[PDB]
PDB file of N, CA and C in Angstrom:
ATOM      1  N   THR A  51     111.089  48.924 147.483  1.00 45.08           N
ATOM      2  CA  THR A  51     111.680  48.906 148.809  1.00 45.08           C
ATOM      3  C   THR A  51     112.703  47.787 148.898  1.00 45.08           C
ATOM      4  N   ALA A  52     113.581  47.899 149.890  1.00 46.04           N
ATOM      5  CA  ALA A  52     114.586  46.871 150.143  1.00 46.04           C
ATOM      6  C   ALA A  52     114.930  46.941 151.627  1.00 46.04           C
ATOM      7  N   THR A  53     114.396  46.004 152.398  1.00 46.45           N
ATOM      8  CA  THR A  53     114.514  45.998 153.845  1.00 46.45           C
ATOM      9  C   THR A  53     115.451  44.885 154.289  1.00 46.45           C
ATOM     10  N   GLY A  54     115.660  44.800 155.599  1.00 46.99           N
ATOM     11  CA  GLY A  54     116.557  43.818 156.176  1.00 46.99           C
ATOM     12  C   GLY A  54     115.795  42.658 156.789  1.00 46.99           C
ATOM     13  N   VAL A  55     116.168  41.448 156.380  1.00 49.66           N
ATOM     14  CA  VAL A  55     115.610  40.217 156.930  1.00 49.66           C
ATOM     15  C   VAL A  55     116.743  39.240 157.195  1.00 49.66           C
ATOM     16  N   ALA A  56     116.543  38.384 158.195  1.00 49.60           N
ATOM     17  CA  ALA A  56     117.538  37.389 158.557  1.00 49.60           C
ATOM     18  C   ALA A  56     117.650  36.327 157.469  1.00 49.60           C
ATOM     19  N   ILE A  57     118.766  35.599 157.480  1.00 46.19           N
ATOM     20  CA  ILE A  57     119.049  34.718 156.355  1.00 46.19           C
ATOM     21  C   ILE A  57     118.210  33.445 156.424  1.00 46.19           C
ATOM     22  N   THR A  58     117.963  32.921 157.617  1.00 44.67           N
ATOM     23  CA  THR A  58     117.011  31.827 157.793  1.00 44.67           C
ATOM     24  C   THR A  58     115.662  32.373 158.254  1.00 44.67           C
ATOM     25  N   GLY A  59     115.121  33.279 157.452  1.00 45.00           N
ATOM     26  CA  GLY A  59     113.868  33.917 157.786  1.00 45.00           C
ATOM     27  C   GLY A  59     112.779  33.631 156.778  1.00 45.00           C
ATOM     28  N   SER A  60     112.421  34.635 155.992  1.00 43.24           N
ATOM     29  CA  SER A  60     111.365  34.496 155.003  1.00 43.24           C
ATOM     30  C   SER A  60     111.681  35.434 153.845  1.00 43.24           C
ATOM     31  N   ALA A  61     110.677  35.748 153.063  1.00 44.65           N
ATOM     32  CA  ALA A  61     110.793  36.741 152.022  1.00 44.65           C
ATOM     33  C   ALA A  61     109.952  37.964 152.368  1.00 44.65           C
ATOM     34  N   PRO A  62     110.468  39.177 152.148  1.00 45.64           N
ATOM     35  CA  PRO A  62     109.682  40.384 152.442  1.00 45.64           C
ATOM     36  C   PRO A  62     108.483  40.601 151.527  1.00 45.64           C
ATOM     37  N   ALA A  63     107.738  41.676 151.773  1.00 46.91           N
ATOM     38  CA  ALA A  63     106.512  41.948 151.038  1.00 46.91           C
ATOM     39  C   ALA A  63     106.821  42.442 149.625  1.00 46.91           C
ATOM     40  N   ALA A  64     105.765  42.629 148.840  1.00 44.44           N
ATOM     41  CA  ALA A  64     105.927  43.032 147.452  1.00 44.44           C
ATOM     42  C   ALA A  64     106.316  44.504 147.349  1.00 44.44           C
ATOM     43  N   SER A  65     106.934  44.849 146.221  1.00 48.33           N
ATOM     44  CA  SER A  65     107.350  46.217 145.948  1.00 48.33           C
ATOM     45  C   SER A  65     107.573  46.371 144.453  1.00 48.33           C
ATOM     46  N   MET A  66     107.141  47.504 143.901  1.00 52.34           N
ATOM     47  CA  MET A  66     107.287  47.779 142.478  1.00 52.34           C
ATOM     48  C   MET A  66     107.136  49.278 142.254  1.00 52.34           C
ATOM     49  N   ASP A  67     107.942  49.834 141.352  1.00 46.92           N
ATOM     50  CA  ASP A  67     107.884  51.263 141.083  1.00 46.92           C
ATOM     51  C   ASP A  67     106.658  51.617 140.241  1.00 46.92           C
ATOM     52  N   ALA A  68     106.396  52.918 140.123  1.00 47.04           N
ATOM     53  CA  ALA A  68     105.166  53.411 139.526  1.00 47.04           C
ATOM     54  C   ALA A  68     105.454  54.519 138.527  1.00 47.04           C
ATOM     55  N   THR A  69     104.583  54.627 137.526  1.00 48.64           N
ATOM     56  CA  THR A  69     104.610  55.690 136.536  1.00 48.64           C
ATOM     57  C   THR A  69     103.307  56.476 136.608  1.00 48.64           C
ATOM     58  N   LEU A  70     103.350  57.732 136.167  1.00 48.54           N
ATOM     59  CA  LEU A  70     102.234  58.659 136.312  1.00 48.54           C
ATOM     60  C   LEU A  70     102.019  59.405 134.999  1.00 48.54           C
ATOM     61  N   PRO A  71     100.805  59.892 134.735  1.00 50.58           N
ATOM     62  CA  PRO A  71     100.544  60.663 133.514  1.00 50.58           C
ATOM     63  C   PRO A  71     100.690  62.168 133.734  1.00 50.58           C
ATOM     64  N   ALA A  72     100.629  62.941 132.613  1.00 45.67           N
ATOM     65  CA  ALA A  72     100.801  64.397 132.736  1.00 45.67           C
ATOM     66  C   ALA A  72      99.761  65.250 132.005  1.00 45.67           C
ATOM     67  N   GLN A  73      99.345  64.849 130.810  1.00 41.75           N
ATOM     68  CA  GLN A  73      98.095  65.186 130.120  1.00 41.75           C
ATOM     69  C   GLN A  73      97.865  66.573 129.491  1.00 41.75           C
ATOM     70  N   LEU A  74      98.599  67.668 129.860  1.00 38.43           N
ATOM     71  CA  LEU A  74      98.835  68.927 129.102  1.00 38.43           C
ATOM     72  C   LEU A  74      97.903  69.334 127.957  1.00 38.43           C
ATOM     73  N   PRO A  75      96.683  69.806 128.220  1.00 36.76           N
ATOM     74  CA  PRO A  75      95.684  69.945 127.145  1.00 36.76           C
ATOM     75  C   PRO A  75      96.000  71.032 126.123  1.00 36.76           C
ATOM     76  N   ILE A  76      95.708  70.734 124.854  1.00 32.28           N
ATOM     77  CA  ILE A  76      95.697  71.730 123.778  1.00 32.28           C
ATOM     78  C   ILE A  76      94.377  71.564 123.016  1.00 32.28           C
ATOM     79  N   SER A  77      93.323  72.220 123.500  1.00 30.36           N
ATOM     80  CA  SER A  77      92.048  72.120 122.796  1.00 30.36           C
ATOM     81  C   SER A  77      91.164  73.358 122.839  1.00 30.36           C
ATOM     82  N   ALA A  78      91.519  74.420 123.558  1.00 31.01           N
ATOM     83  CA  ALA A  78      90.516  75.381 123.999  1.00 31.01           C
ATOM     84  C   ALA A  78      90.646  76.767 123.387  1.00 31.01           C
ATOM     85  N   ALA A  79      91.820  77.384 123.435  1.00 33.04           N
ATOM     86  CA  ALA A  79      91.944  78.796 123.101  1.00 33.04           C
ATOM     87  C   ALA A  79      92.910  79.000 121.943  1.00 33.04           C
ATOM     88  N   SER A  80      92.947  80.234 121.444  1.00 33.76           N
ATOM     89  CA  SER A  80      93.664  80.560 120.220  1.00 33.76           C
ATOM     90  C   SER A  80      93.903  82.064 120.162  1.00 33.76           C
ATOM     91  N   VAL A  81      95.061  82.467 119.640  1.00 35.20           N
ATOM     92  CA  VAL A  81      95.473  83.870 119.592  1.00 35.20           C
ATOM     93  C   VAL A  81      95.224  84.401 118.187  1.00 35.20           C
ATOM     94  N   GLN A  82      94.525  85.538 118.071  1.00 38.47           N
ATOM     95  CA  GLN A  82      94.041  86.008 116.776  1.00 38.47           C
ATOM     96  C   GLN A  82      94.203  87.520 116.623  1.00 38.47           C
ATOM     97  N   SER A  83      93.990  88.001 115.390  1.00 35.19           N
ATOM     98  CA  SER A  83      94.005  89.422 115.033  1.00 35.19           C
ATOM     99  C   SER A  83      93.230  89.622 113.735  1.00 35.19           C
ATOM    100  N   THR A  84      92.813  90.870 113.480  1.00 35.21           N
ATOM    101  CA  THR A  84      92.041  91.241 112.289  1.00 35.21           C
ATOM    102  C   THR A  84      92.655  92.448 111.585  1.00 35.21           C
ATOM    103  N   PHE A  85      92.103  92.790 110.412  1.00 37.66           N
ATOM    104  CA  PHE A  85      92.577  93.929 109.624  1.00 37.66           C
ATOM    105  C   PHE A  85      91.529  95.030 109.506  1.00 37.66           C
ATOM    106  N   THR A  86      90.375  94.715 108.911  1.00 37.18           N
ATOM    107  CA  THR A  86      89.289  95.639 108.550  1.00 37.18           C
ATOM    108  C   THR A  86      89.788  96.817 107.708  1.00 37.18           C
ATOM    109  N   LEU A  87      90.204  96.503 106.489  1.00 38.67           N
ATOM    110  CA  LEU A  87      90.563  97.523 105.516  1.00 38.67           C
ATOM    111  C   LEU A  87      89.485  97.640 104.446  1.00 38.67           C
ATOM    112  N   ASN A  88      89.278  98.864 103.958  1.00 37.40           N
ATOM    113  CA  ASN A  88      88.270  99.133 102.939  1.00 37.40           C
ATOM    114  C   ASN A  88      88.792  98.737 101.563  1.00 37.40           C
ATOM    115  N   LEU A  89      88.080  99.161 100.530  1.00 41.09           N
ATOM    116  CA  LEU A  89      88.478  98.888  99.164  1.00 41.09           C
ATOM    117  C   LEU A  89      88.771 100.166  98.395  1.00 41.09           C
ATOM    118  N   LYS A  90      88.375 101.316  98.932  1.00 43.86           N
ATOM    119  CA  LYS A  90      88.831 102.622  98.479  1.00 43.86           C
ATOM    120  C   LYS A  90      90.144 103.027  99.136  1.00 43.86           C
ATOM    121  N   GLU A  91      90.359 102.605 100.387  1.00 43.87           N
ATOM    122  CA  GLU A  91      91.620 102.849 101.083  1.00 43.87           C
ATOM    123  C   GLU A  91      92.795 102.176 100.395  1.00 43.87           C
ATOM    124  N   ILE A  92      92.573 101.028  99.760  1.00 43.93           N
ATOM    125  CA  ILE A  92      93.670 100.265  99.180  1.00 43.93           C
ATOM    126  C   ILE A  92      93.821 100.615  97.709  1.00 43.93           C
ATOM    127  N   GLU A  93      93.180 101.692  97.279  1.00 47.00           N
ATOM    128  CA  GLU A  93      93.351 102.169  95.918  1.00 47.00           C
ATOM    129  C   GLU A  93      93.922 103.572  95.865  1.00 47.00           C
ATOM    130  N   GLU A  94      93.441 104.474  96.717  1.00 46.75           N
ATOM    131  CA  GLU A  94      93.962 105.832  96.776  1.00 46.75           C
ATOM    132  C   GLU A  94      95.233 105.939  97.603  1.00 46.75           C
ATOM    133  N   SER A  95      95.684 104.846  98.213  1.00 48.95           N
ATOM    134  CA  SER A  95      96.982 104.787  98.866  1.00 48.95           C
ATOM    135  C   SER A  95      97.968 103.970  98.052  1.00 48.95           C
ATOM    136  N   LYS A  96      97.724 103.847  96.754  1.00 52.37           N
ATOM    137  CA  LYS A  96      98.645 103.211  95.831  1.00 52.37           C
ATOM    138  C   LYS A  96      99.150 104.182  94.776  1.00 52.37           C
ATOM    139  N   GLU A  97      98.402 105.245  94.506  1.00 50.65           N
ATOM    140  CA  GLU A  97      98.844 106.317  93.633  1.00 50.65           C
ATOM    141  C   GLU A  97      99.383 107.514  94.400  1.00 50.65           C
ATOM    142  N   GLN A  98      99.320 107.501  95.730  1.00 47.17           N
ATOM    143  CA  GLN A  98      99.765 108.646  96.513  1.00 47.17           C
ATOM    144  C   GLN A  98     101.040 108.369  97.295  1.00 47.17           C
ATOM    145  N   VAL A  99     101.056 107.370  98.178  1.00 47.68           N
ATOM    146  CA  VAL A  99     102.101 107.236  99.192  1.00 47.68           C
ATOM    147  C   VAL A  99     103.419 106.819  98.539  1.00 47.68           C
ATOM    148  N   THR A 100     104.536 107.232  99.140  1.00 46.51           N
ATOM    149  CA  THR A 100     105.852 107.192  98.517  1.00 46.51           C
ATOM    150  C   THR A 100     106.617 105.914  98.844  1.00 46.51           C
TER     151      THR A 100
ATOM    152  N   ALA B   2      93.074 103.836 113.526  1.00 46.54           N
ATOM    153  CA  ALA B   2      94.524 103.935 113.432  1.00 46.54           C
ATOM    154  C   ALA B   2      95.003 103.461 112.068  1.00 46.54           C
ATOM    155  N   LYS B   3      95.049 104.371 111.101  1.00 44.40           N
ATOM    156  CA  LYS B   3      95.481 104.028 109.756  1.00 44.40           C
ATOM    157  C   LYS B   3      96.993 104.135 109.650  1.00 44.40           C
ATOM    158  N   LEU B   4      97.603 103.183 108.953  1.00 47.77           N
ATOM    159  CA  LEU B   4      99.053 103.116 108.887  1.00 47.77           C
ATOM    160  C   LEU B   4      99.659 104.047 107.845  1.00 47.77           C
ATOM    161  N   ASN B   5      98.853 104.687 107.003  1.00 45.05           N
ATOM    162  CA  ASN B   5      99.379 105.704 106.096  1.00 45.05           C
ATOM    163  C   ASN B   5      98.440 106.895 106.006  1.00 45.05           C
ATOM    164  N   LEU B   6      97.889 107.306 107.140  1.00 45.46           N
ATOM    165  CA  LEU B   6      97.046 108.489 107.213  1.00 45.46           C
ATOM    166  C   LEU B   6      97.863 109.767 107.341  1.00 45.46           C
ATOM    167  N   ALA B   7      99.161 109.651 107.582  1.00 43.95           N
ATOM    168  CA  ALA B   7     100.005 110.824 107.741  1.00 43.95           C
ATOM    169  C   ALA B   7     101.217 110.790 106.822  1.00 43.95           C
ATOM    170  N   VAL B   8     101.321 109.794 105.946  1.00 43.93           N
ATOM    171  CA  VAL B   8     102.410 109.707 104.980  1.00 43.93           C
ATOM    172  C   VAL B   8     101.923 109.977 103.561  1.00 43.93           C
ATOM    173  N   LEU B   9     100.619 109.866 103.311  1.00 42.03           N
ATOM    174  CA  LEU B   9     100.051 110.207 102.013  1.00 42.03           C
ATOM    175  C   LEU B   9     100.214 111.700 101.750  1.00 42.03           C
ATOM    176  N   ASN B  10     100.492 112.040 100.502  1.00 40.05           N
ATOM    177  CA  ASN B  10     100.959 113.368 100.149  1.00 40.05           C
ATOM    178  C   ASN B  10     100.040 114.017  99.121  1.00 40.05           C
ATOM    179  N   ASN B  11     100.054 115.344  99.089  1.00 43.44           N
ATOM    180  CA  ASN B  11      99.112 116.138  98.303  1.00 43.44           C
ATOM    181  C   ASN B  11      99.849 116.711  97.102  1.00 43.44           C
ATOM    182  N   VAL B  12      99.543 116.198  95.914  1.00 46.25           N
ATOM    183  CA  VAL B  12     100.237 116.555  94.681  1.00 46.25           C
ATOM    184  C   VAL B  12      99.228 117.159  93.710  1.00 46.25           C
ATOM    185  N   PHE B  13      99.578 118.307  93.129  1.00 49.24           N
ATOM    186  CA  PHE B  13      98.743 118.981  92.141  1.00 49.24           C
ATOM    187  C   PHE B  13      98.930 118.341  90.765  1.00 49.24           C
ATOM    188  N   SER B  14      98.405 118.987  89.728  1.00 47.72           N
ATOM    189  CA  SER B  14      98.521 118.479  88.370  1.00 47.72           C
ATOM    190  C   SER B  14      98.625 119.647  87.401  1.00 47.72           C
ATOM    191  N   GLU B  15      99.167 119.368  86.214  1.00 47.38           N
ATOM    192  CA  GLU B  15      99.448 120.405  85.220  1.00 47.38           C
ATOM    193  C   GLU B  15      98.130 120.864  84.599  1.00 47.38           C
ATOM    194  N   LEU B  16      97.432 121.737  85.316  1.00 47.33           N
ATOM    195  CA  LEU B  16      96.152 122.247  84.844  1.00 47.33           C
ATOM    196  C   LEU B  16      96.020 123.725  85.211  1.00 47.33           C
ATOM    197  N   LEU B  17      97.028 124.520  84.881  1.00 46.92           N
ATOM    198  CA  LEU B  17      96.931 125.951  85.134  1.00 46.92           C
ATOM    199  C   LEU B  17      95.936 126.584  84.172  1.00 46.92           C
ATOM    200  N   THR B  18      94.938 127.269  84.718  1.00 49.30           N
ATOM    201  CA  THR B  18      93.884 127.889  83.928  1.00 49.30           C
ATOM    202  C   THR B  18      94.133 129.386  83.864  1.00 49.30           C
ATOM    203  N   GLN B  19      94.266 129.914  82.654  1.00 50.03           N
ATOM    204  CA  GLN B  19      94.444 131.345  82.464  1.00 50.03           C
ATOM    205  C   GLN B  19      93.114 132.045  82.698  1.00 50.03           C
ATOM    206  N   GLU B  20      93.029 132.813  83.780  1.00 50.51           N
ATOM    207  CA  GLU B  20      91.789 133.459  84.182  1.00 50.51           C
ATOM    208  C   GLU B  20      91.759 134.949  83.893  1.00 50.51           C
ATOM    209  N   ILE B  21      92.886 135.631  84.031  1.00 48.41           N
ATOM    210  CA  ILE B  21      92.951 137.078  83.866  1.00 48.41           C
ATOM    211  C   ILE B  21      92.888 137.426  82.383  1.00 48.41           C
ATOM    212  N   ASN B  22      92.299 138.578  82.078  1.00 47.27           N
ATOM    213  CA  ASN B  22      92.210 139.084  80.713  1.00 47.27           C
ATOM    214  C   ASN B  22      93.236 140.195  80.550  1.00 47.27           C
ATOM    215  N   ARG B  23      94.323 139.894  79.853  1.00 48.73           N
ATOM    216  CA  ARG B  23      95.325 140.882  79.470  1.00 48.73           C
ATOM    217  C   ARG B  23      95.468 140.845  77.949  1.00 48.73           C
ATOM    218  N   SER B  24      94.606 141.599  77.282  1.00 50.12           N
ATOM    219  CA  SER B  24      94.566 141.643  75.833  1.00 50.12           C
ATOM    220  C   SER B  24      95.140 142.961  75.338  1.00 50.12           C
ATOM    221  N   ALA B  25      95.541 142.963  74.071  1.00 48.55           N
ATOM    222  CA  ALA B  25      96.060 144.171  73.432  1.00 48.55           C
ATOM    223  C   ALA B  25      95.639 144.112  71.965  1.00 48.55           C
ATOM    224  N   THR B  26      94.508 144.743  71.653  1.00 49.52           N
ATOM    225  CA  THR B  26      94.019 144.748  70.279  1.00 49.52           C
ATOM    226  C   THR B  26      94.438 146.017  69.552  1.00 49.52           C
ATOM    227  N   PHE B  27      94.067 147.178  70.101  1.00 48.79           N
ATOM    228  CA  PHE B  27      94.325 148.447  69.430  1.00 48.79           C
ATOM    229  C   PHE B  27      95.806 148.769  69.371  1.00 48.79           C
ATOM    230  N   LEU B  28      96.591 148.259  70.318  1.00 46.95           N
ATOM    231  CA  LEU B  28      98.039 148.362  70.199  1.00 46.95           C
ATOM    232  C   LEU B  28      98.559 147.490  69.067  1.00 46.95           C
ATOM    233  N   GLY B  29      97.847 146.417  68.740  1.00 43.94           N
ATOM    234  CA  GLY B  29      98.306 145.469  67.753  1.00 43.94           C
ATOM    235  C   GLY B  29      98.144 145.862  66.305  1.00 43.94           C
ATOM    236  N   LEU B  30      97.652 147.067  65.996  1.00 44.27           N
ATOM    237  CA  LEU B  30      97.512 147.429  64.589  1.00 44.27           C
ATOM    238  C   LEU B  30      97.878 148.881  64.289  1.00 44.27           C
ATOM    239  N   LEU B  31      98.681 149.530  65.121  1.00 45.32           N
ATOM    240  CA  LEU B  31      98.969 150.944  64.920  1.00 45.32           C
ATOM    241  C   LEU B  31     100.160 151.224  64.014  1.00 45.32           C
ATOM    242  N   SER B  32     100.813 150.197  63.456  1.00 43.90           N
ATOM    243  CA  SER B  32     101.963 150.331  62.548  1.00 43.90           C
ATOM    244  C   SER B  32     103.110 151.097  63.219  1.00 43.90           C
ATOM    245  N   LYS B  33     103.736 150.405  64.170  1.00 42.95           N
ATOM    246  CA  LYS B  33     104.767 150.956  65.047  1.00 42.95           C
ATOM    247  C   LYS B  33     105.965 151.510  64.270  1.00 42.95           C
ATOM    248  N   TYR B  34     106.632 152.513  64.859  1.00 42.26           N
ATOM    249  CA  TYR B  34     107.829 153.140  64.283  1.00 42.26           C
ATOM    250  C   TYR B  34     108.854 153.504  65.352  1.00 42.26           C
ATOM    251  N   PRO B  35     110.149 153.341  65.064  1.00 44.24           N
ATOM    252  CA  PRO B  35     111.196 153.706  66.030  1.00 44.24           C
ATOM    253  C   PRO B  35     111.668 155.159  65.989  1.00 44.24           C
ATOM    254  N   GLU B  36     111.033 156.074  66.719  1.00 46.04           N
ATOM    255  CA  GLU B  36     111.457 157.475  66.722  1.00 46.04           C
ATOM    256  C   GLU B  36     112.454 157.724  67.845  1.00 46.04           C
ATOM    257  N   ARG B  37     113.722 157.903  67.491  1.00 48.36           N
ATOM    258  CA  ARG B  37     114.776 158.222  68.455  1.00 48.36           C
ATOM    259  C   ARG B  37     115.069 159.724  68.540  1.00 48.36           C
ATOM    260  N   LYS B  38     114.047 160.562  68.685  1.00 46.81           N
ATOM    261  CA  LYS B  38     114.308 161.989  68.842  1.00 46.81           C
ATOM    262  C   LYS B  38     113.639 162.528  70.094  1.00 46.81           C
ATOM    263  N   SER B  39     113.653 163.846  70.266  1.00 46.09           N
ATOM    264  CA  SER B  39     113.057 164.443  71.451  1.00 46.09           C
ATOM    265  C   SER B  39     111.575 164.714  71.270  1.00 46.09           C
ATOM    266  N   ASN B  40     111.169 165.179  70.093  1.00 45.73           N
ATOM    267  CA  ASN B  40     109.768 165.495  69.850  1.00 45.73           C
ATOM    268  C   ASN B  40     109.463 165.460  68.360  1.00 45.73           C
ATOM    269  N   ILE B  41     108.258 165.004  68.019  1.00 45.42           N
ATOM    270  CA  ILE B  41     107.878 164.839  66.624  1.00 45.42           C
ATOM    271  C   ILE B  41     107.261 166.134  66.121  1.00 45.42           C
ATOM    272  N   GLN B  42     107.725 166.600  64.963  1.00 40.99           N
ATOM    273  CA  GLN B  42     107.270 167.877  64.415  1.00 40.99           C
ATOM    274  C   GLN B  42     106.853 167.650  62.966  1.00 40.99           C
ATOM    275  N   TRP B  43     105.665 168.129  62.612  1.00 40.67           N
ATOM    276  CA  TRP B  43     105.232 168.100  61.222  1.00 40.67           C
ATOM    277  C   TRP B  43     104.476 169.384  60.917  1.00 40.67           C
ATOM    278  N   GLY B  44     104.012 169.550  59.684  1.00 42.33           N
ATOM    279  CA  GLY B  44     103.385 170.798  59.299  1.00 42.33           C
ATOM    280  C   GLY B  44     101.912 170.694  58.970  1.00 42.33           C
ATOM    281  N   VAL B  45     101.111 171.600  59.522  1.00 43.92           N
ATOM    282  CA  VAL B  45      99.674 171.663  59.279  1.00 43.92           C
ATOM    283  C   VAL B  45      99.378 172.940  58.509  1.00 43.92           C
ATOM    284  N   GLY B  46      98.718 172.805  57.364  1.00 45.71           N
ATOM    285  CA  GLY B  46      98.459 173.948  56.513  1.00 45.71           C
ATOM    286  C   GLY B  46      97.024 174.430  56.507  1.00 45.71           C
ATOM    287  N   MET B  47      96.800 175.640  56.997  1.00 46.10           N
ATOM    288  CA  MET B  47      95.491 176.268  56.985  1.00 46.10           C
ATOM    289  C   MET B  47      95.331 177.070  55.697  1.00 46.10           C
ATOM    290  N   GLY B  48      94.286 177.886  55.633  1.00 46.45           N
ATOM    291  CA  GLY B  48      94.016 178.714  54.482  1.00 46.45           C
ATOM    292  C   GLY B  48      94.560 180.115  54.646  1.00 46.45           C
ATOM    293  N   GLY B  49      93.935 181.056  53.946  1.00 50.32           N
ATOM    294  CA  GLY B  49      94.334 182.443  54.078  1.00 50.32           C
ATOM    295  C   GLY B  49      94.276 183.286  52.823  1.00 50.32           C
ATOM    296  N   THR B  50      94.375 182.669  51.651  1.00 50.22           N
ATOM    297  CA  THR B  50      94.348 183.429  50.409  1.00 50.22           C
ATOM    298  C   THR B  50      92.940 183.918  50.104  1.00 50.22           C
TER     299      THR B  50
END
């Protein structure tokens, strides 16, 4: 703050700016996917498909 | 949901099996001849004396 006081007066009260936190968590969830392929499927689709 | 369930293709193999019976035995030993005429004529001799 910056207020008005007379020249033969006193000094005004205290004042100081402030900082704040933000904290944005990364600990909880995750994006995933699966395949589930057999072992006969990956053999008879190697001598057939073009 | 298979990713190549409709692109896989059906291919045969070189295994033709001869099943029908088309043989020719008696034709195979008759000692063939090329007769270019209308009719074959020969002589048959009976008795009589």
